[PDB]
């Protein structure tokens, strides 16, 4: 579960902000939030590697708490 | 010298003889070879001023024309306490230069 997939985001959101968003729940050890080079903008889906299982199990619940720019965010195991 | 890794210092127990430097070596430090800030006078061991050698250059061995000093940085690091700083072997560079000129000239 150490990693989660996160959908439905707005490009003003940032990886550093994202790390602080999910570390509100529990620390994101490895952050991945693609920067698309071609048009220089984000599609808004994320992958998160944690310390161990602990971060992963919480992950799905952490999704409900999240609400970026008046919108929700998908979090599921991976 | 610091530029020649194969040169070798005497390092015996230094005495009351003052080491000197030839015109070519005037104003430089015997250890680290610098031109600035002279701190202490160089003393050489008894054997190194034996006889005819009394008063030759410490660093190269030519007729000495002034006194040799250690610089300030070698004093602070106490490099001035290691022994007689007379160089006891000519090394590869000096020998090669001789044979090269002699071949040509």
């Amino acid at each position: 579960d150490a990693t989660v997939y996160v959908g439905g985001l707005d490009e003003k959101v940032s990886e550093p902000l994202l790390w602080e968003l999910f570390l509100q729940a529990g620390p994101v050890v490895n952050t991945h939030m693609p920067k698309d080079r071609v048009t220089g903008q984000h599609q808004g889906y994320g992958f998160v590697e944690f310390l161990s299982e602990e971060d992963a199990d919480y992950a799905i619940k952490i999704m409900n708490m999240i609400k970026l720019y008046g919108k929700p965010i998908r979090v599921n195991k991976a | 010298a610091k530029h020649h890794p194969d040169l070798i210092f005497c390092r015996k127990q230094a005495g009351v003889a003052i080491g000197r430097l030839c015109e070519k070596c005037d104003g430089k430090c015997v250890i680290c070879d610098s031109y600035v800030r002279p701190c202490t006078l160089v003393r050489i061991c008894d054997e190194c001023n034996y006889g005819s050698y009394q008063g030759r250059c410490v660093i190269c061995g030519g007729p000495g024309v002034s006194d040799a000093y250690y610089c300030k940085e070698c004093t602070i690091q106490e490099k001035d306490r290691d022994g007689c700083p007379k160089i006891v072997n000519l090394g590869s560079s000096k020998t090669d230069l001789f044979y090269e000129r002699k071949k040509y000239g």
Binding site: - | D26, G27, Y35, P38, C39, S66, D67, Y69, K72
Partner: protein, 100 residues
């Protein structure tokens, strides 16, 4: 500079290779053993608080480059004088000094 002002000159850190009449060799005494650089720092160098503050030429008002000089190089060359005291070191009646 003139001959009495040469004690006010600064020295180069490395010793001169022509030893005679030098001011910075060990034998001359101007290169002294166990110098503390912090104590001799303000000697013959600019010090805005100290005694040698940034001066300008008395004639042209442009800044001199030597501590304790009252005349800039060009004005001292042209009038024939010592840059520090202003005594003349050259008789320039027959010399059309050229700044070029």
């Amino acid at each position: 500079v003139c001959e009495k002002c040469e004690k006010k000159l600064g020295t180069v850190i490395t010793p001169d290779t022509w030893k005679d009449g030098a001011r910075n060799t060990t034998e001359s005494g101007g290169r002294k053993l166990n110098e503390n650089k912090a104590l001799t720092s303000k000697k013959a160098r600019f010090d805005p608080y100290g005694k040698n503050k940034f001066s300008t030429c008395r004639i042209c008002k442009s800044s001199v480059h030597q501590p304790g000089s009252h005349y800039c190089q060009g004005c001292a060359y042209k009038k024939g004088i010592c840059a520090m005291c202003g005594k003349k070191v050259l008789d320039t009646k027959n010399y059309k000094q050229t700044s070029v």
